[PDB]
Design a protein around this ligand. Structure first.
Ligand SMILES: O=c1[nH]c(=O)c2nn[nH]c2[nH]1
Ligand SMILES: O=c1[nH]c(=O)c2nn[nH]c2[nH]1
Ligand SMILES: O=c1[nH]c(=O)c2nn[nH]c2[nH]1
Ligand SMILES: O=c1[nH]c(=O)c2nn[nH]c2[nH]1
Ligand SMILES: [K+]
Ligand SMILES: [K+]
Lengths: 296, 299, 302, 298
């Protein structure tokens, strides 16, 4: 009930250590990240009982300026020798608590800024550019970390989660929504073949926090692989609801990644309307949503 | 966990029962709401153990369609005879749990869609129009309500909060930020006179949930009044930090409204840079603060 | 062939106040305190001598766009006038005088509006001179283009003022009937709809000097235009947005004979009645498609 | 000075006729569009002297409701038998002017709603799905058409343009910006190696309007191909300014597509700042953004 910090701390770096040696799965071609260009948007929040008088009295003696937190994060991207956004948050968190002993808790959110490769031609041969990248406004990897300083001054991870945000998938056929309650408030017709359009935010938790850092990359779960599981499962099965779809996606994730403990879904329904006069159009604003956890 | 529902359920109606008989405070001229035009954006979430098979098996037998929740909310705005957004959420929640016995929990968020009065001339007389309103994209009232059906089938409120969101205040002078840690990570200069620009989201919790509904309107705490306390407190004193500003705003709120238990702040710093005096927009990173003031903080 | 800088924000305190304005029945507007002033400027420049900056990569005659930003921001500090229109003229004249190889400059200025707030001082509640609320609602605009002619004289080549971002809903007293009903028509006749319009209004002065504030009795304030729009919308049963904006434009030109013409860009965002059968009507947000209208009213319409 | 219409007319259709047989170029693998899923956002504007009294008098007798324009567009996506967004706009325009004789002008803008393929597994083999697509918020194709009814009742295309919007490209090295004017207003340091970040909107006009419709797909210029030219040209050379980059992109486009008359660019500069406080680290700049407008002809 007393925290402060900095949001929208963007930091971009070239030639981060490549992520290599990740275990591949049948649903995904993902085998690593070259890391020629790496971007992250970090939010940092900190607290501690010794900050009380910064609120109650206007005493700034123990206030790390939020501007300085921004400098801390950006400088640490330059010195980070690891390979994942999760490991970067861990580096920032441990470093920050080691620097500022009066801080008792730090919470970090990191959002990948995704870039995609582009094509260039050199002497007749077209290939991926190592220089020119396309900024993507589509799905992106996320990471969350909370760390605390205990009364015996050890540091402990109290929460850690990885994710995939902003995935927007439409399946043109092979989706039903039937059998729901029909009463005085029901106008929705039964539909045995709708073009289901779902937004997915998927988060996962590791059994062992160390697996999230890429130290042993064979145990890392890449957001890219989660994406490709999601599209494969959506494709493979006649859907009966978004609820049951996210259940089946979660089951496949836990099957493919036994090192995970849980998968959490936040989904939204944005399915198009058939037009007034198959052609579809955008619906009115109200959107359905679902929240669901699958456990290993 | 397992929940599902509908967001962005907009509903507009004219001639909601007016809010009057409120209790005034020195910081605010607020005296009620005409309610000629009323709008709300509702989010509804529901849960219950009996919904498991809708996820695990694709059995929709016990699923209230989210489209039907949308219909339920919109129709109930037509039949609501009360005077506040908080009371509207209570009416929706109680009505919904009574209709659907297999639902164990409902969670509602309501955001006011604010409209402002405009001028019209009628027969040489300029006055506020009863017909034409301006849609506002500035601050707005909010309300939060969670309700449960207990195992013994009684219904109980499990969370209730009211709020003010989207308030953006700049104070051109009379703000200092000095005395903070200056170390190897510090490039921020001391500034004894900055144009502090804060975004405020303020939420309050009543001691007695009935006071939020408007039934006895003298016990209601209006978002307009909270707004006016925030602006007066910001004006009245030299600020030393956003942290300490929100503490003083919270203390004044709890002093003016003894029926409140606590008040929660989420603030953001958006202060302008001096240009490379004239000011300009900063880079994207923004400071923020989260703080709860309780009755234990009172004089 | 043009280049420039957008989103050049500049804020200052205690700009010279705007006073001495001429009033109209529809509006209480009496001036602007200018305790807090903000503007968002876009600048675009051109000139034949800039060709090789494109064709060859030669930057020798390029004013960096960063330097344009510095120019604008510094000139808000030295501006001694009272309107956004005048500020643009000051920037444009100053810029072309500084950079003789630039043949054309185009400026857009958007007001960043702030609203007064209440404070209690010693038991007296009054408007604060210190704390303001940033507004995301309607705002004044200004457009100015200037050229350096072949003979080195400077001339304004376009000037318009405006009001943007006005969103008005009239809950009753609106009809839309009599339109074409054919095989593409699913819209019912509606003799009483809650018409919701977005308005962007621009006006052109007969005499460009009247826009600058030098003789402030000839200035047309966006606040006054706003208040004409709300009054006219209230006063009469609307028959369409088309005819509403015609009537607003006629009133503007009648109230401000120093204006040559007024231009409207309107959009229809009227709510739908809710799907559920219903006590009074309830409305909700429509699907995304929006109607729009563009219309110019001139003195020939009076 | 008198128009009205409808914006944000979204229409989505499955199994539009595929676009096949497009001439390839070295910079791009593009050969066509499966059109399993097709989406467009249309804006329609119409005008005509016979609409005057709808404004001056409130007489709606000759008003096609904007709602009905929306119906017209959406129904015509169902009946369109062609293969390009440009051809769809031509179909809508000709059909609309043929239906409503009192309309003298129609202007259409179409924005592709882009969808990307996704992976699915069958029998352990991973391949692109024919059912599941990913909605993209990145670059997209555009088309513009203005058509008028002449006094002799012939219909005439008065403006026609195709485009690519929303392309955001960053080149990490191999970019300079030096030699610009340094005077009392200049604080920007010269930079011989910046990570240039450009937004590109690219439009092109055909020599012969018929080439935009896909009827002979060998003459069609796909926005995908323009995208890939842009990234190749950006890669290939040390840039000296955005101005000179868009010039070189335009020259390459006109070389690869001799059926084009002109290329028009609207570019923006969003290059990151080096941080205040090992390799370099960058961050987001303040809001002011540079921009350029430029036309290449031939
Ligand atoms: O997948 C769905 N789940 C739902 O709960 C629902 N409600 N309306 N449509 C729906 N679709
Ligand atoms: O009010 C402020 N509080 C802070 O914590 C801070 N940090 N930088 N600037 C600041 N301003
Ligand atoms: O005011 C309106 N003008 C129009 O042209 C129109 N078309 N549909 N609804 C409409 N309303
Ligand atoms: O490429 C650029 N062109 C410009 O005109 C400019 N001005 N500042 N930086 C710039 N970069
Ligand atoms: K009072
Ligand atoms: K008056």
């Amino acid at each position: 009930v007393m925290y402060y910090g900095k949001g929208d701390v963007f930091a971009y770096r070239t030639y981060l250590k490549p992520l290599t040696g990740v275990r591949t799965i049948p649903e995904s071609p993902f085998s690593g990240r070259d890391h020629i260009l790496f971007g992250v948007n970090v939010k940092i929040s900190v607290g501690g009982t010794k900050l009380l008088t910064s609120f109650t009295k206007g005493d700034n003696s123990l206030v790390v300026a939020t501007d300085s937190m921004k400098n801390f994060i950006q400088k640490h991207l330059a010195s980070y020798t690891g390979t994942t956004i999760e490991g970067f948050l861990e580096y920032v968190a441990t470093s920050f608590l080691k620097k500022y002993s009066h801080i008792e808790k730090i919470s970090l959110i990191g959002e990948e800024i995704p870039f995609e490769t582009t094509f260039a031609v050199k002497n007749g041969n077209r290939a991926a550019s190592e220089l020119v990248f396309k900024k993507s406004r589509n799905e992106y990897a996320t990471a969350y970390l909370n760390m605390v300083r205990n009364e015996d001054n050890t540091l402990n991870i109290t929460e850690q989660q990885s994710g995939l945000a902003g995935l927007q998938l439409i399946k043109v056929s092979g989706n039903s929504f039937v059998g729901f309650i029909r009463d005085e408030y029901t106008t929705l017709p039964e539909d045995s073949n709708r073009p289901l359009f779902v937004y997915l935010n998927i988060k996962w938790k590791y059994k062992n926090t160390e697996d999230s850092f890429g130290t042993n990359p064979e145990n890392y779960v890449a957001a890219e692989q989660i994406r490709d599981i999601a599209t494969s499962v959506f494709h493979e099965t006649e859907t009966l609801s978004i609820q049951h779809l996210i259940y089946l996606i979660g089951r496949r994730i836990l099957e493919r990644f036994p090192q995970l403990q849980e998968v959490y879904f936040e989904s939204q329904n944005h399915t198009w309307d058939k037009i007034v006069e198959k052609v579809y159009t955008e619906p009115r604003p109200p959107y359905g949503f679902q929240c669901f956890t699958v456990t290993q």
